[PDB]
Amino acid sequence: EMVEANLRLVISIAKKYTNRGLQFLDLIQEGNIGLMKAVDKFEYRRGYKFSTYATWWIRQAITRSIADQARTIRIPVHM
DNA sequence: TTGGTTTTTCGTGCCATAGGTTAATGACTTTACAGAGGTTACGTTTACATACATTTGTGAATGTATGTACCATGAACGTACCATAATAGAAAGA
């Protein structure tokens, strides 16, 4: 029920990170994986909304996806 | 008067006495082959000192490793020229 009601937050934050690094369906899938990893470690006693906490995780997912291959060769993340 | 048998010399042919170059095996002698004996300058075997390598620990380069807590809620997010005709498909009236 969480993922079927928050796929659209993922696509809304994922359609602004499509700067021609790779085809964007992999970015949609990695955003869904980041949504899963943000739901798996979500707290209730904080009192804040879930989007601000999930934004950092989904940007980390999109960052590691765009820095995973990024070329035909392998370049590390720090480089 | 002329042809032919008979007979005797005479240079030529056969036999015998003399005397010399030159074949014989050898005895040569000279060259060649076969016998040992002292000396040379290597070739193989052996020990010993020092060297490039190769085998170890120790100080620096990167690299995945998990997370960051006001609010972020659907779209292509700029692609593209529009040739030509054999063979089927999903329906529409015959």
Q: Tell me the CA–C1' distance in angstroms for A29 and B90.
A: 37
Q: Tell me the CA–C1' distance in angstroms for A78 and B73.
A: 32
Give the nucleotide nearest to A16 (CA→C1'). Answer: B77
Strands (E), A1-79: none
Could you tell me if A39 and A2 are in contact, meaning their C-beta atoms sit under 8 angstroms apart? yes
Give the nucleotide nearest to A20 (CA→C1'). Answer: B77
Could you tell me if A34 and A50 are in contact, meaning their C-beta atoms sit under 8 angstroms apart? no
Elucidation technique: cryo-EM
Q: What is the DSSP letter of A29?
A: H
- For residue A72, the one-letter residue type is T
- Helix (H) / strand (E) containing A7: helix A2-14
Could you tell me if A57 and A15 are in contact, meaning their C-beta atoms sit under 8 angstroms apart? no
